[PDB]
Swiss-Prot record, chain A:
Keyword terms: Chloroplast, Plastid, Ribonucleoprotein, Ribosomal protein, RNA-binding, rRNA-binding
Pfam families on file: Ribosomal_L20 (PF00453)
Annotated function: Component of the chloroplast ribosome (chloro-ribosome), a dedicated translation machinery responsible for the synthesis of chloroplast genome-encoded proteins, including proteins of the transcription and translation machinery and components of the photosynthetic apparatus.
Annotated source species: Spinacia oleracea (Spinach)
Full protein name: Large ribosomal subunit protein bL20c
HAMAP family in the record: Ribosomal_bL20
GO biological-process terms attached to the record: ribosomal large subunit assembly; translation
Swiss-Prot record, chain B:
Misc. comment: This protein (expressed without the transit peptide) is able to provoke transcription termination from the spinach chloroplast rDNA operon and the E.coli S10 operon in vitro.
Complex formation: Component of the chloroplast large ribosomal subunit (LSU). Mature 70S chloroplast ribosomes of higher plants consist of a small (30S) and a large (50S) subunit. The 30S small subunit contains 1 molecule of ribosomal RNA (16S rRNA) and 24 different proteins. The 50S large subunit contains 3 rRNA molecules (23S, 5S and 4.5S rRNA) and 33 different proteins.
Tissue specificity field: Highly expressed in cotyledon and weakly in roots.
Organism: Spinacia oleracea (Spinach)
Source organism phylogeny: Eukaryota, Viridiplantae, Streptophyta, Embryophyta, Tracheophyta
Protein name: Large ribosomal subunit protein uL4c
Parent-protein residues present: 52 to 261 of 293
Keywords, ordered alphabetically: Chloroplast, Plastid, Ribonucleoprotein, Ribosomal protein, RNA-binding, rRNA-binding, Transcription, Transcription regulation, Transcription termination, Transit peptide
UniProtKB/Swiss-Prot annotation, chain C:
Domain of life: Eukaryota
GO cellular component: chloroplast; large ribosomal subunit
Record key words, sorted: Chloroplast, Plastid, Ribonucleoprotein, Ribosomal protein, Transit peptide
Source organism of this protein record: Spinacia oleracea (Spinach)
Transit peptide among keywords: yes
Gene this chain is encoded by: RPL35
The protein's name in its UniProt record: Large ribosomal subunit protein bL35c
Residues of the full protein shown: 89 to 157 of 159
Lineage: Eukaryota, Viridiplantae, Streptophyta, Embryophyta, Tracheophyta
Function: Component of the chloroplast ribosome (chloro-ribosome), a dedicated translation machinery responsible for the synthesis of chloroplast genome-encoded proteins, including proteins of the transcription and translation machinery and components of the photosynthetic apparatus.
From Swiss-Prot, chain D:
UniProt keywords, alphabetically: Chloroplast, Plastid, Ribonucleoprotein, Ribosomal protein, Transit peptide
Region listing for Disordered, in residue ranges: 1-41
Family recorded in the similarity comment: Belongs to the universal ribosomal protein uL15 family.
GO molecular function, one term: structural constituent of ribosome
Domain of life according to the entry: Eukaryota
Protein name: Large ribosomal subunit protein uL15c
Entry function: Component of the chloroplast ribosome (chloro-ribosome), a dedicated translation machinery responsible for the synthesis of chloroplast genome-encoded proteins, including proteins of the transcription and translation machinery and components of the photosynthetic apparatus.
Presence of keyword Lipoprotein: no
GO biological process terms on file: translation
Segment of the intact protein contained: 80 to 256 of 271
Subunit composition and interactions: Component of the chloroplast large ribosomal subunit (LSU). Mature 70S chloroplast ribosomes of higher plants consist of a small (30S) and a large (50S) subunit. The 30S small subunit contains 1 molecule of ribosomal RNA (16S rRNA) and 24 different proteins. The 50S large subunit contains 3 rRNA molecules (23S, 5S and 4.5S rRNA) and 33 different proteins.
UniProt organism field: Spinacia oleracea (Spinach)
Basic residues bias: start-end ranges: 12-22
Length: 115, 210, 69, 177
RNA sequence: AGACAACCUGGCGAACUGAAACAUCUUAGUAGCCAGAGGAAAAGAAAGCAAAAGCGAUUCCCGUAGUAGCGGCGAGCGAAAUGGGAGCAGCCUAAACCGUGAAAACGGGGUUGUGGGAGAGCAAUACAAGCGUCGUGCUGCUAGGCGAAUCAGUGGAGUGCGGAACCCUAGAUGGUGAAAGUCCAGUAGCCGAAAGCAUCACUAGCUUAUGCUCUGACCCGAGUAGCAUGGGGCACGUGGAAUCCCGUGUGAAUCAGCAAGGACCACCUUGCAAGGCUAAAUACUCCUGGGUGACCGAUAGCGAAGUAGUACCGUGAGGGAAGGGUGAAAAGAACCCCCAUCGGGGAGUGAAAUAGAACAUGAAACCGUAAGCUCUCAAGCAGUGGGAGGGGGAACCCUGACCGCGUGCCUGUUGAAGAAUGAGCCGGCGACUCAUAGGCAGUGGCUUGGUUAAGGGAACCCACCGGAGCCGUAGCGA
RNA sequence: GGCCAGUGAGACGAUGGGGGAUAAGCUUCAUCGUCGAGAGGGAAACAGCCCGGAUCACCAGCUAAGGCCCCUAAAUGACC
RNA sequence: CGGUAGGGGAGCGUUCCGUGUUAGGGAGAAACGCGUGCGUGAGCCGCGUUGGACGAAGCGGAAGCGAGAAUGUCGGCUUG
């Protein structure tokens, strides 16, 4: 009542295809194609949560420079004394985004904050 | 339940012959009739599927090479299951399945099957046959003029099964004659076009009550 | 087609009591009783019901005996 | 009810779990047998009622009572209580009763030892209608109930045991009143 | 007089093992070896079982009962009678006395049992059975034959498809360019044998037995039963240890006797030993014929789909492989050119030969080739999130400058990336299965009961039958 | 209570102790924490310390332990 | 709503059988890939080729039933 299979070849062609552009044996050699697959998914997690964290970082430093451009000692620190004291509903470090597109606008923001 | 007109060779509507059969409670009918089928055709099978274990295959029982001092696995016979030479683990050997199904339940699978096929244009019904020189032409033409012929498996049965209809019923593959001695759950469980005779309608009624 | 033999060495020990629960017999009685107080001796005679742990070592080891629980 | 349409009720059958197919199944790998030990190893395994070297409970305890020789037999006469007899199935009061009548009635069925049983009428239970019983010796309390009822009751002599002539003659000699 | 697959009887007869060690015990009287014989063998017609009631030669299945019991009362072994079925079948001899006798010996009467047979009388015994002589006649086996019904269009080919007829006691099967009751061999049904062989029947011979009764007191399987003693097997391990066969030595009576009825003794009940034969139900397969397959289909199934117990290996016993599929038909490639006639390109065949003979689908590892983008101040379990620059058919896919994060996978550990294990890679083969039983849960049937098992059933499955048996109805007590 | 498992040498840290030499990442017990079986951030790297408990998505925000010169986010911010 | 040993619940898939000489199929059955189509996922729908013959779906049944780990194992291939 032999019951032999082929469902491996599909089980495994699928992976064989998800691991393309893997530049070594990591793209040919099934028995390692598997663990590679696993490890790409894992780094997809860690790089995803770390991407939220990472883009905050990038905007903090970018807005921080735009503010320090005022030649007097301002900061990304003190800009937020003054940006929450005056009720501005959280421009969400995307004032760091216009700060590079509409810089004159960000100088308008900044002057209204100083008042 | 529901009545049903008797037919004849000509195909008209003499008689009433109301048929009442004991049936399983609703919502319990499928389990009751399914289980009955599956004991039917599970029981019927036949083992006829064998194989050889590590002990019967002809390969020898010489330790092919010593335990240690060789760099190689610990193979212990060339009749082993792992080697592709033979020796199957847990192969099929002739098992003899059989499913004792309680008589008073099995009956009720029949009564349910029948009692479900009737009253919805799936039970035509006759009273007799007179064939001489049995010839499979008058009979199939009977089916034609009779009820539904179309050679669509039309289970069909009778009482005491005179030879000269047995002998002209076999040529037609779709419908097979039945007798109480030969009654089975399977073929009366198309509910498609099953016929009866009055000997079966009362014999049937007699066997199962309410 | 085979059957399960009953560990006779523990059917000569137990018993079951209509309401269906194993009893047994207490130990240390036919040997060295000058020592033993009376009080202890009529405590070492009463057939007492048996604890649960072994009540599961045996109900499997003695299968044809109609015990419930 | 076509063959295709029929299906079995839900929960009627449960697919047997196959141990070791995959981790996702959860019985894969170890299979819940854990790691190592006698239980894990394939084989007959440790005998039940075995304490791993401590005296088994059966061994420590003395064998019950009277173990060596004993009839250890109870049943002699099958016993059918009056409440069971008077109540439930009810006799016409026209009917004879006895073991043959009872088996037919179905109140009492003797299969393993039809021959060994003689029958007995228990004191317990009350019979609404007086009846005549040809059954052998009954309990006094039970006997009293029938008499109070007034139903005719007749003792039955089942068998006679052969005795040695000398012994038989001795009994006659005693006949001193 | 040799041969044998398995089944059987006999003799000899282990051990690893289970007892969580091991000497009693268990594997087990199994395996194996030797010796016979059969299609079956062995057993068998009562010195039996029973239990105040009855049975009636053996042999098997169910079930009593995993009960009674045995057991370093440990592991474990485990009956039987009653009950139900399958199958039935009974005979021949040894005395006692008679007719012979070169005193052995043969002939005839005699064979049964709450006791028959050796003894005494008929109105001319017949029906019954077996066997054989050869002989006769059907029934089957070993050849075989007759045997119904259609064509068109489609597309390399039609049995498929659309259309249109017919047969069917024959839509069982195998083939036929592609699948069909109507193409072929066939099948239902029917006819058939020199001759050989079967299972029966009959026509004529031997042979059948208690047709009956009564009063004596002869014999009624002689170094055997007992006993002592040593054992073996009995379900029963020397235990109160019966029955049952054996080694050593003693060594009864026979019917107003003897053996058994679980030491033994009485009374009662059964059977009557030390001579023999006998069919069936029954276990088996190297095999033959018929059929079937929720069996395999090319490392599977026989080890074996071709010179497979082959090649090969060993002195020898013995071990033991791998190798299948061009096409419907070789139509297997005329001729030409490169040409050591290896192998090729045209031509030709074919529907197709990038189907051309190390030829049928053809995966992955591995070996190349071409195109797109890219690496030579680099640093990395080599991916990932962000994406510079460029190429693609004109927002999605390829490649990737540079930054950040990221200490292989499984086993296994208090603890591994671990410099602990394992794996060269790829593809396959490869692991909690079945049988029967106890317990529990889910589901269903039935119920003032539930269920049948063996066994039958015009095969096997099976409707229906089969109530023996089991479970639930009364406990306490050794 | 029923049906059924796995486990049976844990490790360190805090405390009270024995043994040791008030030596050990030692050993042995008692009461708790983490690891075991648990990720994430701080600790440069770093099971067993600190905050904390991961159903998922988010190119949104507020904080804890810890921090604000550069490499890396955030004052080379105030005054003693 | 972390989770190893382990327990319970719900599912997919493969060869075969019932419904069948099924629906469909030489305008063409399966292995390879385009579709982030679709699913929590095992996997499913579609989509193509020289070859190219079989065979779904649904409700059910059975299992020689799911593989990178056994210094496994048979074959083909590499590294040096």
């Amino acid at each position: 009542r032999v019951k032999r299979g082929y469902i491996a070849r599909r089980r495994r062609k699928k992976i064989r295809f998800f691991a393309s552009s893997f530049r070594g044996a990591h793209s040919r050699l099934t028995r390692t194609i598997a663990q590679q697959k696993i490890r790409a998914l894992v780094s997809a997690h860690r790089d995803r949560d770390r991407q939220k964290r990472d883009f905050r970082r990038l905007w903090i430093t970018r807005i921080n420079a735009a503010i320090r451009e005022r030649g007097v000692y301002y900061n990304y620190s003190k800009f937020i004394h003054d940006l929450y004291k005056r009720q501005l509903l959280l421009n969400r470090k995307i004032l760091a985004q216009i700060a590079i597109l509409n810089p004159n606008c960000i100088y308008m923001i900044y002057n209204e904050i100083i008042k | 339940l529901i009545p049903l007109p008797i037919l004849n060779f000509s195909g008209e509507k003499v008689g009433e012959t109301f048929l009442n059969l004991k049936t399983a409670p609703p919502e319990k009918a499928r389990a009751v009739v399914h289980r009955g089928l599956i004991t039917h055709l599970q029981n019927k099978r036949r083992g006829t599927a064998s194989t050889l274990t590590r002990a019967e295959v002809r390969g020898g029982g010489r330790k092919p090479y010593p335990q240690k001092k060789t760099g190689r696995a610990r193979r212990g016979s060339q009749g082993s299951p792992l080697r592709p030479g033979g020796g199957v683990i847990f192969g099929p050997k002739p098992r003899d399945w059989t499913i004792k199904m309680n008589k008073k339940e099995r009956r009720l699978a029949l009564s349910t099957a029948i009692a479900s096929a009737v009253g919805n244009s799936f039970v035509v019904e006759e009273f007799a046959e007179n064939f001489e020189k049995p010839k499979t032409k008058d009979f199939i033409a009977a089916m034609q003029r009779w009820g539904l012929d179309p050679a669509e498996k039309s289970l069909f049965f009778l009482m005491d099964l005179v030879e000269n209809v047995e002998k002209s019923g076999r040529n037609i593959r779709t419908l097979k004659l039945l007798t109480p001695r030969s009654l089975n759950l399977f073929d009366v469980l198309n509910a498609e076009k099953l016929v009866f005779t009055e000997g079966t309608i009362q014999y049937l009624n007699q066997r199962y009550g309410v | 087609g085979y059957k399960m033999k009953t560990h006779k060495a523990s059917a000569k020990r137990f018993r079951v009591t209509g309401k269906g629960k194993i009893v047994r017999r207490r130990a240390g009685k036919q040997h060295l009783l000058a020592k033993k107080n009376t009080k202890r001796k009529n405590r070492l005679s009463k057939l007492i019901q048996v604890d649960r742990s072994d009540y599961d070592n045996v109900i499997g080891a003695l299968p044809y005996l109609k015990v419930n629980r | 009810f076509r063959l295709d349409n029929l299906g079995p009720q839900p929960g009627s059958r449960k697919k047997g779990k196959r141990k070791g197919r995959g981790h996702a199944a959860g019985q894969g790998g170890s299979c819940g047998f854990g790691m190592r030990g006698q239980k894990s190893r394939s084989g007959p395994g440790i005998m039940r009622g075995f304490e791993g070297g401590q005296m088994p409970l059966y061994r420590r305890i003395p064998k019950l009572r009277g173990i060596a020789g004993g009839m250890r037999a109870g049943l002699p006469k099958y016993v059918p209580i009056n409440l069971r007899d008077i109540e439930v199935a009810g006799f016409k009061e026209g009917e004879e009763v006895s073991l043959e009548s009872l088996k037919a009635k179905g109140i009492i069925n003797p299969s393993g030892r039809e021959r060994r049983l003689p029958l007995k009428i228990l004191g317990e239970g009350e019979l609404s209608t007086k009846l005549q019983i040809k059954a052998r010796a009954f309990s006094g309390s039970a006997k009293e109930k029938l008499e109070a009822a007034g139903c005719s009751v007749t003792v039955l002599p089942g068998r006679k045991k052969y005795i040695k002539e000398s012994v038989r003659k001795n009994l006659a000699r005693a006949d001193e009143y």
